[PDB]
RNA sequence: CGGAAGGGCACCACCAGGAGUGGAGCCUGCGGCUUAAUUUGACUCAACACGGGAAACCUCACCCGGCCCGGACACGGACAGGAUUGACAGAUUGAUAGCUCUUUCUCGAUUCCGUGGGUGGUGGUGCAUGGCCGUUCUUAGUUGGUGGAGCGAUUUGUCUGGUUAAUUCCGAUAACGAACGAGACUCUGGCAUGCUAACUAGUUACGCGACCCCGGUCGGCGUAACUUCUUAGAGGGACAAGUGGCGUUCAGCCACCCGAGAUUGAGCAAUAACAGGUCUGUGAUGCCCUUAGAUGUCCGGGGCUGCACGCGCGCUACACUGACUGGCUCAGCGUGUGCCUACCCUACGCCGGCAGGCGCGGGUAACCCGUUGAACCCCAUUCGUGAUGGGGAUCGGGGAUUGCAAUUAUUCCCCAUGAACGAGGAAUUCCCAGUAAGUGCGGGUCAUAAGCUUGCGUUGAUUAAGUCCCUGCCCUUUGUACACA
C-alpha cells in the first residue's frame, strides 16, 4: 500500500505542472502522501565534429539534454492510484507505478 | 585489361537420357527388379537410390558412404 | 562450399559488425547509449532526436 | 535465384493477408524476424519480391534500413491468378 | 519488462523512434502536404497524431492508407495489433508551417513550372496567409552548369539567439 | 592598392613578464624513396593526433588468388523421353571453394543460353552539384520603400564632435519611416540561515553495543523532527543603484560606501562571397566507366606500421624546490548488463609477487561499485653533483589477459640491459585572474586500448590594466593606366 509513482519528463516546466497536479490531486482526495522529491538531473554531453569532412578548423559541438525525475509515494490502495494517473496525460511525462 | 591465365570453365552438366530406364530391369511377370541400393535414411527411405560407383557408394543429400 | 565460405568470417567483434543505421557506413560511430549512428547524420538529425546546443 | 517452393509460397501468402510486409537492408541475416517459423532468409525476400517490384505491382519506399512495400489492387489479381484465391477474402488493410 | 533497459538508453531510443518514424513518413507522405507528427506514449496503447494538409489524400480508399500505416509500425518496430491507433488531423494556418510550401515549391518545379513563376507563388501565399517576414533561398544549377543562387528576403527576420529555437520555422 | 595620412580595436600583435616548441629520447601524421599496395583526399593563418583514420581480419578505399550472380523484367530457343541448382571421395586447392578434372546419386519449373535492359560501385569529375563545415569577420557592418543630388552610371539615409566592446547613444543633419548584426535571447558559476519537497542524501538529539580515564570517538544499528551541509522548481538578487570628481553637464567616464557579484564563460551570431574541402557520410544526385574473365559481393594473406632524410601536432626528462621508500589525505564531470549484439560497472573471500583465474551477490543506477580513501604536494629515512638512485630509449629471458588468428614483440606484469639529454641558435607558439602552468580522473576512439582529444577535479602564480613599434581588423580623406582588383 506504500505505492511509488515515478515522474520522468524531458521538459523542465512541463514536469513541474504534473508533479504539482499530483500534489493537488493527493490533497483533493485526502490521502497520506510523501512529497515529490526533486531528484537531480543528468546531462548527456555529446561533443562531436560539426564538419562532415576533415577540412576546416577544429570546432566541437555541445549537445546536452537534462532529463529530470521525481518520485511520489502514496499511502493509499491501488484503486485510488489508477484513478489519478489515467486522466490527462501528456507526451512529456512518463508514469511508472511501483507497489513497494 | 589483358588476361594471361585462361579462366576455369563452368562444369557443363552431363545430361542423362532416360534415367529411370536404367533404374529397373523388366521381367515378363508383374515384378520389378532393383539394381541399385536404396538409402536407409529417414529423409529418404525407398524412392532415392545411391551412387553405386566402382569402389564405394554415396547418397546425394544425406552424405552416407558404403565402402568396400 | 559457397554457403560455408560466404559467412565463415566471424562478426562477433570488430568495427565491421557495427555500422550506421542510415548510411550503413563503418566510421564515425557513436556507440554510446546504444545509438548505433554516424556522427555526420547525428548533427543533421539532431532536431529529429532532440539534441540542441544551448551552451 | 533458385528458391524452394516452401519459401516461394510463404513470401506470397504473407503479402496477401496484410497489405504491407517489411524487410531489412541487410543480406547477412539468417531468418526474417517477422516470420520465425519458416526459413525465409533476407536475400530471398529482397530479390524474389524485386521480381514483383520490377513489373510494377507494388509501391516502393525505404526508411534508413528497411524496404516498405504497399501492395495495390492491381497486384491483388496477380496473387489471385497464381495462388488460386477467392475474391471474397480481402486484405486486412482493406477491411473496415 | 524483462531486460529492463535504462532510462538513458530509452529516450535515446525514443528519440531514434521519433526520428525514424517521422523520417519514414516524410519521404512516403510527401505528395500529401506533410506538416509534422506527434506521438503520445501511454501504457498498453500507442497514440500517434499525424498532421497533413489535404485530408482527402490522407485516407486513400476509405482509410486504406491510414490502415497501411497501422501495420507498418506493427511489423517493423515490434508493436501489438490494435495497440497503435492513428488519427488524421487538418492543418490550421498552413502558410506559417515552413515545410508545407517547401514541398509545394518542388511539385511546381518538378511538375514543369518556371523557377521564376513558382517563386512568386510561395512568397505570395506566405504574405496572403500573414507573415511578418521570411527568408526564401533557392540555390543550385540554373540555366547551365555554374551554380547560381537567388535569395528573396523582405520584412523582419532574426538569425541570432534563442528566438531561432521556437519563434521561427526553418525548412 | 598605397613602404599616404588621420582615427579606433586585437596577446591567432608589441612592451613588461610567465610557460613552451625548435636541443635529446619515444609516438602520431605528412613529403620523398621502394616494393604487389606502403590506398587516397587535404598544403599560410583555414593541410600535416586532420578525414573521427589508436589498421593481425572487418573497417580498406590497394594488391596477390579463387568462389558466386543476388543479370531482375520482357522476347526467341530449351525440356518433363528432364530447363536448371548440389555433392562423399582422389588430383589440384589455402579450405571439408564439385572451383574444375576421371566416375555417378539427388532438384522439380524456382528456372539456363543469346537480345533489349536493370542493378551495384569508399569508381572518376567539389571547376555540375545540393547539403554541411571553415574562411572573409572576432571585428562591425549591411539592405528595402518614400524623398533629395546628378542626363546617366550612381549617391544620401549608413554621420561633424563627444562617448561606447560596438552603425553605442547623445547630438547636428535631405533626410524620414523601417530591418538585421552587435545589442537583445538561452545555458552555467559562486549570494539565498526564506518556500516546496525528500526512507534512492544527510543534520541535530537519543536508544543501545564497544573503547579510555562525567567527558571524547565509532559512514556500528535503529528512531522524534528538519533541510544548515546533498539536490532541483518557483524565484529573488545588479541596475551605476547611491556618493565624489571629469565631460555641452547630454550621451556617458573614473574612484569609493554597502553589497556574492560595480566588465564570469559559452551557444546563436546581418548582406554577400570563396571556383577552399567533402561524389570516400548518405537508398542525396547530373554526366562518363565496369557489369561476368566485374571498379558488385565473399573468403585467406600482406600493406596502410618499411626507412639515409626533412617537417608538424604530442609525452618524458635534462635533477637536491629533486629521486626513492613508507605514513598521510581531500573531487565532480561522469560511466555501467545492449533489437540485431554473440559484448557491462563491479563489491567479498580466495590461488599466485604480478598480470590473470574460481565461487557467489548489488546496481538499468542519489540504492551498488563509491562516502569516488586520484595524484604533485604534508611528515620521516636513504641518496649528494657522479650523465649518479634523474632519464628510460634500445634489447633478452619468463606469466597471463582479449582475440579463431599477434609473427612486425595486440595489451599488461617480473628481472635485466641503462644510450643521448648539462635549460636548447637564428626564430616561433599560448596567456593575462583560479588566469598560464604543475597534477590526476571520466567520455569518444575499445573484442583487447589514450602518446590524441572533449570535459572535470587538485595546486596555482610573474607582469600589465598601456600601445600601434611589428603583425592583423573597421572607417574617412586622398591618387590610380588596377577591376579574375
UniProtKB/Swiss-Prot annotation, chain A:
The modification N6-acetyllysine is found at residues 17, 58. Signal peptide: none annotated. One of its GO terms (cellular component) is small ribosomal subunit. It is found in: Cytoplasm. GO terms for biological process: translation. Polyubiquitinated by ZNF598 via 'Lys-63'-linked ubiquitin chains when a ribosome has stalled, initiating the ribosome quality control (RQC) pathway to degrade the potentially detrimental aberrant nascent polypeptide. Deubiquitinated by OTUD3 and USP21, antagonizing ZNF598 activity. Ufmylated by UFL1. The modification Phosphoserine is found at residue 76. GO terms for molecular function: RNA binding; structural constituent of ribosome. Keywords: Acetylation, Cytoplasm, Isopeptide bond, Phosphoprotein, Ribonucleoprotein, Ribosomal protein, Ubl conjugation. Belongs to the universal ribosomal protein uS10 family. Component of the 40S small ribosomal subunit. Component of the small ribosomal subunit. The ribosome is a large ribonucleoprotein complex responsible for the synthesis of proteins in the cell. This is Small ribosomal subunit protein uS10. It comes from Oryctolagus cuniculus. The chain holds residues 18 to 117 of 119 of the full protein.
UniProtKB/Swiss-Prot annotation, chain B:
A zinc finger (C4-type) spans 39-62. Disulfide bonds: none annotated. The modification N6-acetyllysine is found at residues 22, 31. Monoubiquitinated at Lys-25 and Lys-31 by RNF25 in response to ribosome collisions (ribosome stalling): ubiquitination promotes subsequent activation of RNF14, leading to EEF1A1 ubiquitination and degradation and rescue of stalled ribosomes. Deubiquitination at Lys-31 by USP16 is required for maturation of the 40S ribosomal complex. There is a cross-link at residues 25, 31 (Glycyl lysine isopeptide (Lys-Gly) (interchain with G-Cter in ubiquitin)). It is found in: Cytoplasm; Nucleus, Nucleolus. Residues 1-13 are annotated as: Disordered. Component of the 40S subunit of the ribosome. Part of the small subunit (SSU) processome, first precursor of the small eukaryotic ribosomal subunit. During the assembly of the SSU processome in the nucleolus, many ribosome biogenesis factors, an RNA chaperone and ribosomal proteins associate with the nascent pre-rRNA and work in concert to generate RNA folding, modifications, rearrangements and cleavage as well as targeted degradation of pre-ribosomal RNA by the RNA exosome. Part of the 40S ribosomal subunit. Part of the small subunit (SSU) processome, composed of more than 70 proteins and the RNA chaperone small nucleolar RNA (snoRNA) U3. This is Small ribosomal subunit protein eS31. The lineage of its organism: Eukaryota, Metazoa, Chordata, Craniata, Vertebrata. The gene is RPS27A. The chain holds residues 83 to 150 of 156 of the full protein.
Curated annotation (Swiss-Prot), chain C:
Its cofactor is Zn(2+). GO terms for molecular function: structural constituent of ribosome; zinc ion binding. The modification Phosphoserine is found at residue 8. It comes from the Eukaryota. It comes from Oryctolagus cuniculus. Component of the small ribosomal subunit. The ribosome is a large ribonucleoprotein complex responsible for the synthesis of proteins in the cell. Keywords: Acetylation, Cytoplasm, Endoplasmic reticulum, Metal-binding, Methylation, Phosphoprotein, Ribonucleoprotein, Ribosomal protein, Zinc. One of its GO terms (cellular component) is cytosolic small ribosomal subunit. This is Small ribosomal subunit protein uS14. GO terms for biological process: cytoplasmic translation. Binds 1 zinc ion per subunit. The gene is RPS29. NCBIfam families: PRK05766.1. Pfam families: Ribosomal_S14. Zn(2+) binds at residues 20, 23, 38, 41. The modification Omega-N-methylarginine is found at residue 11. It is found in: Cytoplasm, Cytosol; Cytoplasm; Rough endoplasmic reticulum. Belongs to the universal ribosomal protein uS14 family. Component of the 40S small ribosomal subunit. The modification N6-acetyllysine is found at residue 47.
From Swiss-Prot, chain E:
Methylation by PRMT1 is required for import into the nucleolus and for ribosome assembly. It comes from the Eukaryota. The modification N-acetylalanine is found at residue 2. Its EC number is 4.2.99.18. This is Small ribosomal subunit protein uS3. Residues 21-92 form the KH type-2 domain. The chain holds residues 1 to 171 of 243 of the full protein. Endonuclease activity is inhibited by MgCl2 on apurinic/apyrimidinic DNA but not on UV-irradiated DNA. Its main location: cytoplasm. The modification Phosphothreonine is found at residues 42, 70. The modification Phosphoserine is found at residues 6, 35, 104. Component of the 40S small ribosomal subunit. Identified in a IGF2BP1-dependent mRNP granule complex containing untranslated mRNAs. Interacts with HNRPD. Interacts with PRMT1; the interaction methylates RPS3. Interacts with SUMO1; the interaction sumoylates RPS3. Interacts with UBC9. Interacts with CDK1; the interaction phosphorylates RPS3. Interacts with PRKCD; the interaction phosphorylates RPS3. Interacts with PKB/AKT; the interaction phosphorylates RPS3. The keyword Lyase applies. The modification N6-acetyllysine is found at residue 62. It catalyses: 2'-deoxyribonucleotide-(2'-deoxyribose 5'-phosphate)-2'-deoxyribonucleotide-DNA = a 3'-end 2'-deoxyribonucleotide-(2,3-dehydro-2,3-deoxyribose 5'-phosphate)-DNA + a 5'-end 5'-phospho-2'-deoxyribonucleoside-DNA + H(+). It is an enzyme of class 4 (lyase). The modification Asymmetric dimethylarginine is found at residues 64-65, 67. GO terms for cellular component: cytosolic ribosome; cytosolic small ribosomal subunit; mitochondrial inner membrane; nucleolus; spindle.
Amino acid at each position: 500500500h506504500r505505492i511509488r509513482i515515478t515522474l520522468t519528463s524531458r521538459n523542465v516546466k512541463s514536469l513541474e505542472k504534473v508533479c504539482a497536479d499530483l500534489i493537488r490531486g493527493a490533497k483533493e482526495k485526502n490521502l497520506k502522501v510523501k512529497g515529490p522529491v526533486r531528484m537531480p538531473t543528468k546531462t548527456l554531453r555529446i561533443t562531436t565534429r560539426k564538419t562532415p569532412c576533415g577540412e576546416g578548423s577544429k570546432t566541437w559541438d555541445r549537445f546536452q539534454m537534462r532529463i529530470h525525475k521525481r518520485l511520489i509515494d502514496l499511502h493509499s490502495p491501488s484503486e485510488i492510484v489508477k484513478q489519478i494517473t489515467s486522466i490527462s496525460i501528456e507526451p512529456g511525462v512518463e508514469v511508472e507505478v511501483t507497489i513497494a | 585489361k589483358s588476361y594471361t591465365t585462361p579462366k576455369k570453365n563452368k562444369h557443363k552438366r552431363k545430361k542423362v537420357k532416360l534415367a529411370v530406364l536404367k533404374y529397373y530391369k523388366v521381367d515378363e511377370n508383374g515384378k520389378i527388379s532393383r539394381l541399385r541400393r536404396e538409402c536407409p535414411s529417414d529423409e529418404c527411405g525407398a524412392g532415392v537410390f545411391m551412387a553405386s560407383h566402382f569402389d564405394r557408394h554415396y547418397c546425394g543429400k544425406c552424405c552416407l558412404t558404403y565402402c568396400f | 562450399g559457397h554457403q560455408q565460405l560466404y559467412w565463415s568470417h566471424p562478426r562477433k567483434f570488430g568495427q565491421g559488425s557495427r555500422s550506421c543505421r542510415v548510411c550503413s557506413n563503418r566510421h564515425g560511430l557513436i556507440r554510446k547509449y546504444g545509438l548505433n549512428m554516424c556522427r555526420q547524420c547525428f548533427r543533421q538529425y539532431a532536431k529529429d532526436i532532440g539534441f540542441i546546443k544551448l551552451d | 535465384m533458385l528458391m524452394p517452393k516452401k519459401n516461394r509460397i510463404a513470401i506470397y501468402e504473407l503479402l496477401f493477408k496484410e497489405g504491407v510486409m517489411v524487410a531489412k537492408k541487410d543480406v547477412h541475416m539468417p531468418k526474417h524476424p517477422e516470420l520465425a517459423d519458416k526459413n525465409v532468409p533476407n536475400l530471398h525476400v529482397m530479390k524474389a519480391m524485386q521480381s514483383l517490384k520490377s513489373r510494377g505491382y507494388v509501391k516502393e519506399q525505404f526508411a534508413w534500413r528497411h524496404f516498405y512495400w504497399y501492395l495495390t489492387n492491381e497486384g491483388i489479381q496477380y496473387l489471385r491468378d497464381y495462388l488460386h484465391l477467392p475474391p471474397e477474402i480481402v486484405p486486412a488493410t482493406l477491411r473496415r | 519488462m524483462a531486460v529492463q533497459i535504462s532510462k538513458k538508453r530509452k529516450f535515446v531510443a525514443d528519440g531514434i523512434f521519433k526520428a525514424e518514424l517521422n523520417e519514414f513518413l516524410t519521404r512516403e507522405l510527401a505528395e500529401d502536404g506533410y506538416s509534422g507528427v506527434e506521438v503520445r506514449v501511454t501504457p498498453t496503447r500507442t497514440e500517434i497524431i499525424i498532421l497533413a494538409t489535404r485530408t482527402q489524400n490522407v485516407l486513400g480508399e476509405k482509410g486504406r492508407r491510414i490502415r497501411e500505416l497501422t501495420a507498418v509500425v506493427q511489423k517493423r518496430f515490434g508493436f501489438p495489433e490494435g495497440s497503435v491507433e492513428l488519427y488524421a488531423e487538418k492543418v490550421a494556418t498552413r502558410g506559417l508551417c515552413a515545410i508545407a510550401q517547401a514541398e509545394s515549391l518542388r511539385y511546381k518545379l518538378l511538375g514543369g513550372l518556371a523557377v521564376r513563376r513558382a517563386c512568386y507563388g510561395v512568397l505570395r501565399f506566405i504574405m496572403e496567409s500573414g507573415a511578418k517576414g521570411c527568408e526564401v533561398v533557392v540555390s543550385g544549377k540554373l540555366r547551365g552548369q555554374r551554380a547560381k543562387s537567388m535569395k528573396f528576403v523582405d520584412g523582419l527576420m532574426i538569425h541570432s539567439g534563442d528566438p531561432v529555437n521556437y519563434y521561427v520555422d526553418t525548412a
